[PDB]
């Protein structure tokens, strides 16, 4: 009797290999393809930013490279910080760019950066733009001579915002909040 | 319900649909199960060892 | 070796050695089709031969007397 | 090597290569690692459980 033909016991695969989105930076969003978010949602990311922020500093991570370029959006809007990313001096404290003393790195300095973020979130607009110039940065911002224009900021900004950009970028390190208050402020801002 | 339901799943919408009971028998038990109003994202993704269904015995998780 | 079966007409062992013969024309078929080594078969392709229908050893039923 | 990689395996084949090696401080520890000369027919299933390494201690599983 017969070689008989077989129909394969046949097997479906339904495995799955992860895929990720290089998303833009919320600098190239911002500044760069320059899109709109809703007042709303432009809290919802400074509260992400801010939620990250205080999990770094639990675990004693000071993440001192922080710039609007180095936090990403994905789906969701789901903000992602990382190392992953003219910026050499705009988001560093007064002392970290004046190099006063050696890498005087601590939690406030990464909050000095986070007020700058939230500054350029709530303007659509770098700040100090009406100027330029690279040692006249240095200068005026090491020495005390401007702040950010606060003037610039969205009509739309909660009064609570334009205080807290006011106040995570208060000159001096002892003046301004750390992320459990800041963070704090912002849920409570938001609701 | 709905309150119940973004207390513990976080979301922010209200739920599509539940199914509440209890079995009587030797195993005496009773369950909440809700359907969301949208799939979230990583629904097939995070391949590790959760399909959100907690089990607590005696109200203890 | 089953020719003494045959010839004294031992179709009860004729029909308990068609399952074994059917067996490895199974695994040996499969393993000529897949282009692989017969010995990398496995018990879950036996399960796989029980989903849906079955078998087709109601013929080999009958060569036990037709291969004579 | 062989006949104990078929043994822990039941492989019918040798191993392709195998690695050796003991370490040792506060973790003390030996081990045998073997690369198999033919990716398992199963190898990338979802659905299957992997025996691959096994962990003993004062040699009991």
Redesign the interface.
């Given at each position: 009797?017969?070689?008989?033909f077989?129909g394969?016991?046949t097997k479906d695969?339904?495995?799955?290999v992860?895929q990720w989105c290089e998303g833009s930076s919320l600098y190239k969003h911002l500044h760069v393809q320059e899109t709109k978010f809703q007042m709303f949602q432009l809290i919802d990311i400074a509260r992400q930013t801010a939620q990250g922020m205080d999990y770094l500093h639990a675990k004693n991570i000071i993440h001192r490279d922080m710039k609007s370029n180095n936090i990403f959006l994905h789906?969701?809007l789901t903000v992602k910080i990382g190392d992953f990313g003219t910026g050499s001096v705009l988001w560093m404290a007064p002392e970290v760019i004046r190099m006063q003393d050696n890498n005087p790195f601590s939690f406030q300095s990464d909050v000095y950066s986070y007020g700058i973020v939230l500054y350029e979130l709530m303007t659509g607009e770098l700040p100090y733009s009406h100027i330029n110039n690279r040692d006249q940065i240095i200068f005026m911002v090491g020495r005390g001579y401007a702040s950010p224009d606060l003037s610039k900021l969205y009509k739309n900004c909660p009064k609570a915002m334009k205080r807290l950009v006011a106040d995570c970028v208060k000159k001096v390190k002892e003046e301004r909040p750390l992320f459990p208050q800041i963070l704090s402020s912002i849920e409570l801002l938001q609701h | 319900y709905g309150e119940f339901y973004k207390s513990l799943t976080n979301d922010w919408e209200d739920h599509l649909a539940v199914k509440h009971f209890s079995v009587e028998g030797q195993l005496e038990f009773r369950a909440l199960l809700f359907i969301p109003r949208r799939a979230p994202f990583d629904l097939f993704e995070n391949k590790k060892k959760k399909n959100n269904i907690k089990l607590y015995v005696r109200r203890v998780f | 070796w089953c020719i003494d079966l045959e010839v004294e007409e031992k179709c009860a062992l004729m029909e308990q050695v068609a399952h074994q013969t059917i067996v490895m024309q199974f695994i040996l078929e499969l393993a000529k089709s897949l282009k692989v080594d017969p010995r990398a078969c496995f018990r879950q392709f036996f399960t796989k031969i029980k989903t849906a229908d079955r078998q087709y050893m109601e013929g080999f039923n009958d060569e036990l007397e037709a291969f004579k």
């Open positions: 009797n017969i070689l008989l077989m394969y016991m695969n339904l495995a799955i992860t789906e969701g | - | -």
